[PDB]
Symmetry: C3
Subunit: 129 residues, 3 copies
């Protein structure tokens, strides 16, 4: 899958690396993909450049808030439910990020919708499962 | 929904907030979601960093151009048609942005595909409707 | 379609433009859309801000690596397969980018999901095929 993170400026590069490693671990745990199925980008924003409310749910947001968009081949409802919990558990334990600071949106594509290198469609050719 | 804006550098932060407010109002009006269902990011680009033409339609593009990507649960074709008109109307009235300077693309997902906080799937648990 | 590029800092704006032009050519060739169906953004990243592995496929990633995300109406499987090959073909020939440095993810939407200008839905009104 591809994980795209949107955060506010303010973290060191070490704290960004911790957040990416903790999130990658949770993704691998929840989806059962290979450990080297790692594709992640980080976009840093100034305070004027993200607005993230809570739909009245009573969360909890600070400048450490992490918005994660995920593009993935289909996953079961349970895999998704598990990933959210695994992700906030790892971000709390390993990065000190409050679960109230984590927002996730997933979008689905299919086998033909990926090319990992060399102009190849590796799910189609069977190079990948 | 999640609303991601791509614009060129040049606006003050007040003018950015005005754009974000106007778009959010249009979205709430078109789609009927709660007023605090607000999730917006902005990425600012140098001239070398966005190219946005017109598919030969005859628009209109200036440095003020706004590309908006939306991720949303399913909406009717009517609601989308309505949103595009509400959005340009609001951006023109509230921000002075020409309707020729507004480009939108929407992507759909489903109930299971959202977690708003605490590792919860609120559309699934019924915390949100739904 | 909308082509969103994520790259590391390092290229001149001429090098960026040559990347965008090559990719646009490939997409026009593979999908048969009008030449002025051109909608592209670029986000530049510091070394800390993208991690792109290979899922054990044996690629080849340098600081020149390009991650492209495409939003498009539906395309046949063959068209997507052709696009990936045409893309790396052009990026190598015109930009000097190794095919091991090209990663593509596509996401699909429908006619009702686009508004190119003036609050119009051009695929719905028939202004556009």
């Amino acid at each position: 899958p591809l994980l795209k993170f949107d955060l506010f400026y303010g973290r060191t590069d070490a704290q960004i690396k911790s957040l990416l490693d903790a999130a990658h671990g949770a993704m691998v745990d929840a989806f059962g993909v290979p450990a080297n199925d790692r594709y992640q980008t980080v976009s840093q924003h100034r305070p004027g450049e993200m607005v993230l409310e809570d739909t009245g749910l009573g969360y909890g947001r600070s400048s450490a808030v992490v918005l994660l968009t995920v593009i993935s081949r289909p996953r079961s409802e349970e895999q998704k439910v598990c990933f959210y919990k695994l992700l906030t558990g790892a971000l709390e334990r390993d990065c000190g990020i409050s679960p109230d600071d984590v927002i996730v949106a997933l979008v689905e594509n299919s086998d033909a919708d990926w090319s990992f290198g060399r102009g190849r469609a590796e799910f189609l050719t069977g190079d990948l499962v």
